[PDB]
Amino acid sequence: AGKKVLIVYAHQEPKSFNGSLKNVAVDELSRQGCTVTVSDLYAMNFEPRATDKDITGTLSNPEVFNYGVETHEAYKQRSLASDITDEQKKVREADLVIFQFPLYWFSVPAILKGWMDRVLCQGFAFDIPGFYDSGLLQGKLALLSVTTGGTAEMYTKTGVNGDSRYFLWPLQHGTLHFCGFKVLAPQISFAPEIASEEERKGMVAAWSQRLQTIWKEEPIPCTAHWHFGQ
Amino acid sequence: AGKKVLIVYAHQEPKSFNGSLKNVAVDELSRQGCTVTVSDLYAMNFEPRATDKDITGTLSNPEVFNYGVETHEAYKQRSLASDITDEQKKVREADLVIFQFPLYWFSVPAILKGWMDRVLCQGFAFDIPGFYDSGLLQGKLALLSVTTGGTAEMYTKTGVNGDSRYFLWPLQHGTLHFCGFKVLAPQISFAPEIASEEERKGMVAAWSQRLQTIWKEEPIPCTAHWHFGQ
Numbered sequence: 001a002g003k004k005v006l007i008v009y010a011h012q013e014p015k016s017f018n019g020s021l022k023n024v025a026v027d028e029l030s031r032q033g034c035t036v037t038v039s040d041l042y043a044m045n046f047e048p049r050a051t052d053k054d055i056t057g058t059l060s061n062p063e064v065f066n067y068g069v070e071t072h073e074a075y076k077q078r079s080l081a082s083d084i085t086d087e088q089k090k091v092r093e094a095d096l097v098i099f100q101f102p103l104y105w106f107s108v109p110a111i112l113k114g115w116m117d118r119v120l121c122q123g124f125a126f127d128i129p130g131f132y133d134s135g136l137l138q139g140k141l142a143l144l145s146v147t148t149g150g151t152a153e154m155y156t157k158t159g160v161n162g163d164s165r166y167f168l169w170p171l172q173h174g175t176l177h178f179c180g181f182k183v184l185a186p187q188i189s190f191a192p193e194i195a196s197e198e199e200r201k202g203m204v205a206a207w208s209q210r211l212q213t214i215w216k217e218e219p220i221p222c223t224a225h226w227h228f229g230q
Numbered sequence: 231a232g233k234k235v236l237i238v239y240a241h242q243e244p245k246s247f248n249g250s251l252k253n254v255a256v257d258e259l260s261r262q263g264c265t266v267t268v269s270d271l272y273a274m275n276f277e278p279r280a281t282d283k284d285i286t287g288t289l290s291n292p293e294v295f296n297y298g299v300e301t302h303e304a305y306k307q308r309s310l311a312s313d314i315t316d317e318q319k320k321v322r323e324a325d326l327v328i329f330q331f332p333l334y335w336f337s338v339p340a341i342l343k344g345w346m347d348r349v350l351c352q353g354f355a356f357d358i359p360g361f362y363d364s365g366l367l368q369g370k371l372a373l374l375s376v377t378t379g380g381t382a383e384m385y386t387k388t389g390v391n392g393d394s395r396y397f398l399w400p401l402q403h404g405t406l407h408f409c410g411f412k413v414l415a416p417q418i419s420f421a422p423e424i425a426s427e428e429e430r431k432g433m434v435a436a437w438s439q440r441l442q443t444i445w446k447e448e449p450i451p452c453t454a455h456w457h458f459g460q
């Protein structure tokens with residue numbers, strides 16, 4: 001309040017722990033007066049593939065299809081497919097984008113990778129060049145809220161998975177920061193599946209709690225040294 | 231010896247630089263007398279979404295759908311969807327898997343991320359426990375062949391985009407090594423669209439030339455140190 005929040009949510013099951021974290025993010029920010037929108041990608045059957053159907057009407061060059069060039073020209077000429085233009089308007093208006101997802105292979109599920117390949121297009125997200133700290137979406141906050149199968153200890157620098165910031169890098173720096181976002185600190189709920197149940201309700205409530213002061217937070221100093229450095 | 235290769239390929243335009251790197255891989259390994267298979271994900275309209283459509287049997291927990299639990303059970307039961315089992319059969323038989331793709335947001339295009347999410351399921355590619363050096367696909371080689379928009383210097387330490395290896399981590403270590411593969415050194419073909427004809431032509435021949443000696447190669451030490459250093 002008086003802010004707009006988009007939650008991009010990527011889980012198949014409403015009773016999941018991811019559902020719960022999305023449902024408290026809605027409740028708590030609703031409570032505070034914020035304007036809230038949720039893109040439930042599985043329930044929308046969101047199309048993850050970057051293809052020629054993403055451009056309506058006719059293309060610059062049907063001899064050799066280049067996806068980046070074509071989507072860029074289609075953004076400028078307002079001829080993107082409507083699923084994409086709908087998401088862009090939500091992002092455009094949002095002051096905070098929250099991504100709520102289970103970690104798949106040290107990254108986002110494919111349905112959410114496709115939202116990012118398709119919606120964050122050239123002309124809207126960034127414009128080769130006019131990027132990083134000057135990316136087209138500067139002023140907006142972005143926040144990853146990730147659940148993991150693996151425990152907190154596995155995600156340290158000398159444990160099996162290496163350090164959490166290592167996988168964060170393509171998402172946080174290569175995507176969010178590249179587009180102009182200022183990135184709040186990931187929220188990582190480590191290993192909900194191996195409960196309890198008690199410790200679940202508490203991970204959830206720390207999420208609720210943190211969202212009480214979300215607007216006070218400072219953005220991470222988005223650098224190579226934050227993700228890897230000493 | 232006789233060898234089987236799978237090329238998992240993710241570009242939309244047969245005439246692209248990616249198309250050409252894939253075709254010369256086919257020509258060169260074909261010429262050596264290797265068995266070669268290409269999964270052309272876009273021409274297959276490959277399904278990247280991990281949904282409950284991926285299980286044809288009675289669900290293990292039909293009240294609360296968890297994708298990892300259900301695909302693991304579906305795999306032991308032989309109740310996965312046929313597109314997934316067709317890919318697993320190609321991977322199972324392959325001695326080498328080459329991924330051929332344009333970098334999208336510091337990672338794979340979503341259609342390829344969906345191949346990772348849905349094909350590399352628990353019970354086939356890995357087990358809890360039975361991961362990293364004990365992953366189920368032990369024995370097999372894997373190689374990333376990645377094209378970029380950025381140079382060829384932007385991809386160093388400082389370094390607009392940071393070191394190239396930073397973004398390889400989730401793919402190489404978190405996915406491939408985790409499934410037991412030994413990973414060979416990425417083929418990164420920087421900035422083809424900027425590049426002039428002599429540089430394109432020669433990037434294409436440098437790949438051809440490298441494949442001549444591919445079974446002579448040793449895998450990378452797939453570590454935090456290789457990826458990040460210092």
Ligand SMILES: Cc1cc2nc3c(=O)[nH]c(=O)nc-3n(C[C@H](O)[C@H](O)[C@H](O)COP(=O)(O)OP(=O)(O)OC[C@H]3O[C@@H](n4cnc5c(N)ncnc54)[C@H](O)[C@@H]3O)c2cc1C
Pocket residue numbers: 011013015016017018019020101102103104105106107147148149150151192193197200201204294296297298346347348404
């Ligand atoms: C393809 C694939 C790739 C993967 N790659 C990785 C990886 O790279 N790294 C990694 O660490 N893990 C990985 N995983 C594992 C995955 O990240 C975890 O399975 C997932 O994050 C668990 O979250 P969930 O929301 O789906 O759990 P859920 O099982 O849906 O939730 C956990 C439990 O909490 C319960 N619950 C729901 N809401 C509440 C609430 N309100 N209060 C109390 N309890 C509640 C649920 O009913 C359930 O019992 C991968 C999994 C898959 C399927």
Ligand SMILES: Cc1cc2nc3c(=O)[nH]c(=O)nc-3n(C[C@H](O)[C@H](O)[C@H](O)COP(=O)(O)OP(=O)(O)OC[C@H]3O[C@@H](n4cnc5c(N)ncnc54)[C@H](O)[C@@H]3O)c2cc1C
Pocket residue numbers: 066067068117118174241245246247248249250331332333334335336337377378379380381422423427430431434
């Ligand atoms: C959603 C999205 C996200 C992206 N994210 C990133 C990112 O994170 N980092 C980054 O660096 N880049 C990124 N890019 C840029 C992208 O990776 C490049 O556009 C891509 O790697 C170029 O490969 P291509 O095959 O499409 O090149 P093409 O445009 O197809 O190749 C350029 C030229 O090569 C020619 N060619 C093909 N074969 C040959 C041949 N054998 N001999 C001579 N010429 C040939 C073609 O005719 C063409 O004219 C992103 C792009 C998109 C669309």
Ligand SMILES: Cc1cc(=O)n(C)c2c3c(ccc12)OCO3
Pocket residue numbers: 105106149150151154161298352404405408
């Ligand atoms: C890469 C990875 C690391 C990890 O710590 N865990 C628990 C994983 C997992 C998967 C797939 C990948 C991983 O499915 C269920 O649990």
Ligand SMILES: Cc1cc(=O)n(C)c2c3c(ccc12)OCO3
Pocket residue numbers: 068122128174175178335336378379380381384391
């Ligand atoms: C993250 C990134 C780094 C980069 O160096 N380049 C060229 C990019 C690009 C994209 C999207 C992201 C990137 O579309 C066209 O070129």
Ligand SMILES: [Zn+2]
Pocket residue numbers: 172173174177178222223224
């Ligand atoms: Zn950054």
Ligand SMILES: [Zn+2]
Pocket residue numbers: 402403404407451452453
């Ligand atoms: Zn590794």
